[PDB]
Design a protein around this ligand. Structure first.
Ligand SMILES: C[C@H](CCC(=O)NCCC[N+](C)(C)CCCS(=O)(=O)[O-])[C@H]1CC[C@H]2[C@@H]3[C@H](O)C[C@@H]4C[C@H](O)CC[C@]4(C)[C@H]3C[C@H](O)[C@]12C
Ligand SMILES: C[C@H](CCC(=O)NCCC[N+](C)(C)CCCS(=O)(=O)[O-])[C@H]1CC[C@H]2[C@@H]3[C@H](O)C[C@@H]4C[C@H](O)CC[C@]4(C)[C@H]3C[C@H](O)[C@]12C
Ligand SMILES: C[C@H](CCC(=O)NCCC[N+](C)(C)CCCS(=O)(=O)[O-])[C@H]1CC[C@H]2[C@@H]3[C@H](O)C[C@@H]4C[C@H](O)CC[C@]4(C)[C@H]3C[C@H](O)[C@]12C
Ligand SMILES: C[C@H](CCC(=O)NCCC[N+](C)(C)CCCS(=O)(=O)[O-])[C@H]1CC[C@H]2[C@@H]3[C@H](O)C[C@@H]4C[C@H](O)CC[C@]4(C)[C@H]3C[C@H](O)[C@]12C
Ligand SMILES: C[C@H](CCC(=O)NCCC[N+](C)(C)CCCS(=O)(=O)[O-])[C@H]1CC[C@H]2[C@@H]3[C@H](O)C[C@@H]4C[C@H](O)CC[C@]4(C)[C@H]3C[C@H](O)[C@]12C
Ligand SMILES: C[C@H]1O[C@@H](n2cnc3c(N)ncnc32)[C@H](O)[C@@H]1O
Ligand SMILES: C[C@@]1(C(=O)O)N[C@H](C(=O)O)C[Se]1
Ligand code: MET
Ligand SMILES: [Cl-]
Length: 346
């Protein structure tokens, strides 16, 4: 019964069987109650502020070949770009002028910048009195150390899938063990660390989703980014099925229940598979939004998956748009950098 599973989630009895049953039950009443539970936990632990992280996707060059990703090195049907360090710093300054209190720098795994150009950019943005989050992939410990000394605050490195076998198949350059080692290094170096996964990958099972939730809970990540897999036509997974929105939403809800004081975005991928999907997600456990701040002409060239929303509008539309979103949801913009505010419990 769904009622018993809800009761067990409310009492914090997070067993593998409870999580599996929550993900397996398709009843509308159960799902809606699960979403309401997550929404209420969010409100109680992290409040009504929705934190805005402005993302600058500064290079679409990548040395890796992940099977799901439109930026994979084997994709020749993509114009590659690199923003200059001046462009990046000035684009970050514009976001700070527009009210962003975190700047996220994301790229393909592009050797050009690494490590010293990143360090220089980070130092310049940190002068602006905002948080800096990096999302640059897997690099040596030394690189991560240099970026932390340069002033970076946070690092996003989704774990993608906690099934090592599936991970290696989808990410043939690397392994789950290396991904985890990177995440543990980042945590040791004092970053606020973000993990997370895709839902609906080819070959991924419900039990794999449970393992993603247990992985996240085990490592107590500061941020958890979850979205559906969206097939990209210039990849080997072009003909695979999209991930299910509702199932993905359930993963966000369960993440909030498991990690009640974490920061959880309503991802652009959620807003891409379903119109209004980010807004739904912000009402089912999420408390962060990441407006795209990549300038034209580059924005349209950074498509990990197709259909990405926010491409046709002026490149300064996203921050005002999310501020309108936050208001029409009855929520408030973040007042500070939106770092994790831990609530120690039992
Ligand atoms: C209550 C009103 C008016 C019903 C009436 O005609 N009077 C009806 C009209 C259209 C309905 C929504 C849509 O169907 C889409 C969606 C289907 C899901 O399954 C359940 C949720 C949701 C949002 C529905 C909820 C509700 O049911 C709505 C607002
Ligand atoms: C907006 C729609 C439709 C509501 C509706 O239209 N229902 C009839 C009208 C009811 N009114 C009170 C307005 C008038 C009643 C008098 S009347 O004469 O119209 O019958 C309702 C129906 C189901 C609702 C979601 C679920 O809960 C799950 C989840 C819980 C979270 O916490 C918040 C997010 C989320 C996604 C909810 C959002 C929203 O809330 C939904 C979509
Ligand atoms: C960038 C330009 C020129 C002036 C400038 O360079 N301004 C730096 C402001 C720096 N901060 C954001 C840190 C101020 C915080 C003040 S606050 O009192 O809000 O704490 C200024 C002039 C008018 C400003 C917009 C409007 O206002 C409306 C709206 C208010 C929201 O809120 C944030 C978004 C938005 C669209 C604003 C963005 C930006 O800002 C604008 C374009
Ligand atoms: C109307 C669109 C389909 C649009 C389309 O692409 N056509 C479908 C696709 C995903 C659906 C939602 C999710 O199921 C989660 C949740 C379940 C609750 O029960 C009712 C509310 C809610 C928000 C659903 C409402 C609605 O039903 C959605 C938006
Ligand atoms: C300029 C564009 C259009 C509009 C659309 C939504 C508007 C925001 C919301 O109203 C929430 C909030 C209310 C505060 O009072 C002032 C700050 C803030 C962030 C607003 C600023 C601005 O006015 C926005 C961005
Ligand atoms: C930046 C994050 O984007 C996600 N990502 C990469 N490719 C896709 C895709 N085809 N569909 C959805 N999400 C994807 C990965 O989870 C990555 O970590
Ligand atoms: C920024 C990001 C996140 O969840 O942190 N969201 C992106 C998206 O959904 O497009 C892919 Se990574
Ligand atoms: C553009 S994908 C996200 C950044 C990095 N390449 C990663 O895979 O973690
Ligand atoms: Cl962040």
């Amino acid at each position: 019964t769904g009622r018993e599973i809800l009761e067990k989630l409310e009492r914090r009895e997070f067993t593998r069987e409870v999580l599996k049953e929550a993900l397996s039950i398709n009843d509308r009443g159960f799902n809606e109650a699960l979403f309401k539970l997550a929404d209420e936990i969010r409100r109680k632990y992290v409040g009504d502020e929705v934190h805005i992280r402005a993302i600058i996707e500064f290079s679409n060059v990548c040395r890796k070949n992940c099977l799901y990703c439109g930026l994979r090195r084997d994709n020749k049907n993509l114009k590659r770009y690199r923003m200059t360090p001046e462009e990046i710093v000035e684009r970050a300054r514009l976001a700070v002028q527009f009210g962003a209190k975190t700047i996220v720098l994301q790229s393909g795994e592009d050797p050009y910048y690494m490590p010293d150009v990143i360090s220089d950019i980070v130092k310049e943005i940190k002068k602006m009195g905002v948080a800096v989050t990096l999302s640059l992939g897997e690099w040596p410990r030394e690189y991560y150390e240099k970026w932390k000394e340069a002033g970076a605050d946070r690092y996003l490195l989704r774990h993608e899938t906690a099934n090592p076998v599936l991970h290696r198949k989808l990410r043939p350059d690397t392994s789950f063990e290396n991904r985890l080692n990177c995440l543990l290094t980042l945590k040791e170096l004092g970053y606020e660390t973000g993990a997370g996964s895709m839902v609906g990958l080819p070959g991924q099972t419900i039990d794999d989703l449970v393992d993603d939730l247990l992985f996240l809970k085990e490592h107590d990540f500061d941020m958890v980014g979850i979205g559906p897999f969206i097939p990209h036509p210039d990849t080997p997974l072009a003909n695979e099925k999209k991930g299910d929105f509702t199932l993905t939403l359930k993963m966000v809800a369960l993440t909030r229940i498991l990690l009640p004081d974490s920061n959880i975005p309503a991802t652009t991928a959620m807003g891409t598979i379903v119109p209004g999907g980010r807004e739904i997600t912000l009402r089912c456990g999420a408390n962060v939004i990441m407006p795209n701040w990549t300038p034209s002409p580059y924005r349209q060239l950074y498509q990990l998956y197709p259909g990405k929303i926010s491409v046709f509008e002026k490149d300064t539309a996203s921050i005002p748009s999310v501020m309108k979103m936050i208001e029409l949801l009855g929520r408030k913009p973040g007042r500070d950098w939106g770092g994790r505010k831990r609530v120690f419990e039992t």
